[PDB]
Amino acid sequence: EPCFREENANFNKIFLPTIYSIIFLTGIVGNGLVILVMGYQKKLRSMTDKYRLHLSVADLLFVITLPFWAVDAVANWYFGNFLCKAVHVIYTVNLYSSVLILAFISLDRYLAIVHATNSQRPRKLLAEKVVYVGVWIPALLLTIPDFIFANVSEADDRYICDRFYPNDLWVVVFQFQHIMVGLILPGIVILSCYCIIISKLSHSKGHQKRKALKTTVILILAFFACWLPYYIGISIDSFILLEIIKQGCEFENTVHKWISITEALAFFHCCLNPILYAFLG
C-alpha cells in the first residue's frame, strides 16, 4: 500500500521555531547564569550542585545547537554535513547525559538518606571521580551510530539533516534501545531508590531536619513528565514499524505530528534546572 508521507504541516513550521526560540533564550540565559554562579565563583555548597552543574553543562551544550533546529524547522539544512553530525551527536549526548545525571542524583540521595552514618567518602568519591566514567563515557559511547549514520541528503524537494539506515530493523532496534536506555532502566533505578528513601524516612518521623529531597523530587518528576508523551509516541511508532499496528497511513501521519509536537515540548527540561534554582523549589 502507498503511504505517501506528506504532512502539509503549515502550523508546525510556525509553531516549532517559536518553541525552539523560547527554549533557546531561557536555556542559554539560565545555564549561563548557573555556570557563572557555580562553575566559576565556586558558590556550590551541597553535593547535589556538582551534578546540577554537569546537567547545566550538558543543557548549555544542547541549547547552543538548538537554533540549528529552529532554522531547520521552517527552512531546510544548508549548513553542512559536519554540522549535521555535530548537532546530532550533541543532541544524543545531552539526551543520555541528563538522564544519567538524574539517576546519579537519585543514587546520591539514596546514599545520603539511608546510609547516613558511613557514606561520606563514597558520595564524595562518586561526585568527583565516578560521575564522569558513569555518565559522559556511556553518553559518548552511545553516539557511535550518530557519528556513522547521520548525513544530510536530498529528499527530492530540499535538503534533510537526519540519519539513514540500510534496513528498517536497524531503525526499530535503535528506537527500542533509545526507549530502554532513556526511560525504562533509569526510571526503575530512580523509583527503587526513592521507594527505599520513602520507606526509610517513614521510620524517622520524629525529626524533620532535611528538606533537600523536595528539590530533586520536583526536578525528576518534571523531567519525566516532560519526556513521557514523546516516549509514548515513539513507542507507538516503533510498534507500528514492527507490523503490529496496521491502521492506515493517516494514523501514521497523526503519530508523526504527535511525535514532532511532543518532542518540541519535551525540550522544556532545558528550562528546568535554572528555573528551579531561581525559585529555590
Partner 1 sequence: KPVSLSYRCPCRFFESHVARANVKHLKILNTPNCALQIVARLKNNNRQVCIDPKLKWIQEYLEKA
Interface with partner 1 includes 243 (CB under 8 A)? Answer: yes
192-201 long-range CB contacts below 8 Å, 24 or more apart?
Answer: 193/106, 193/107, 193/109, 193/110, 194/106, 194/109, 194/110, 196/110, 196/114, 197/109, 197/110, 197/113, 197/114, 200/113, 200/114, 201/113
249-255 long-range CB contacts below 8 Å, 24 or more apart?
Answer: 249/1, 249/3, 249/4, 249/5, 252/3, 252/5, 253/5, 253/7
Interface with partner 1 includes 126 (CB under 8 A)? Answer: no
Burial (CB < 10 A; 0-12, 13-18, 19+), residue 42, is: exposed
Q: How far is CA 205 from each of CA 106, 143, 193, 209, rounded to the nearest angstrom?
A: 21, 45, 19, 10
Short-list 183, 175, 176, CA closest to 99: 183
Binding range to a second copy, per CB under 8 A, among 19-27, 94-102, 121-129, 166-174: 19-27
Interface with a second copy includes 228 (CB under 8 A)? Answer: yes
Q: Which does 205 bind (CB under 5 to 8 A by kind): partner 1, a second copy, none?
A: a second copy
Instruction: Please state whether 160 falls in left (phi above 0), alpha (psi between -120 and 50) or beta.
Output: beta
Q: How many residues bind a second copy (CB under 8 A)?
A: 43
Interface with partner 1 includes 171 (CB under 8 A)? Answer: yes
DSSP H or E stretch at residue 163: strand 159-163
State in angstroms the smallest separation of the CB of 250 from partner 1.
13
Interface with a second copy includes 37 (CB under 8 A)? Answer: yes
Q: Which does 120 bind (CB under 5 to 8 A by kind): partner 1, a second copy, none?
A: none
State in angstroms the smallest separation of the CB of 121 from partner 1.
36
Interface with partner 1 includes 14 (CB under 8 A)? Answer: no
Q: Which does 254 bind (CB under 5 to 8 A by kind): a second copy, partner 1, none?
A: a second copy
Interface with partner 1 includes 155 (CB under 8 A)? Answer: yes
DSSP 8-state class, residue 3: -
Chain contacts with partner 1 (rule: CB under 8 A): 1-5, 88, 91-92, 95, 146, 150, 153-157, 160, 162-166, 168, 171, 174-175, 177-178, 182, 234, 237, 243, 246, 249, 252, 256, 259-260, 263
Chain contacts with a second copy (rule: CB under 8 A): 8, 10-11, 13-14, 17-18, 21-22, 25, 29, 32-33, 36-37, 41, 43, 74-75, 191, 195, 198-199, 202-203, 205, 224-225, 228-229, 232-233, 236, 239, 244-245, 247-248, 250-251, 254-255, 258
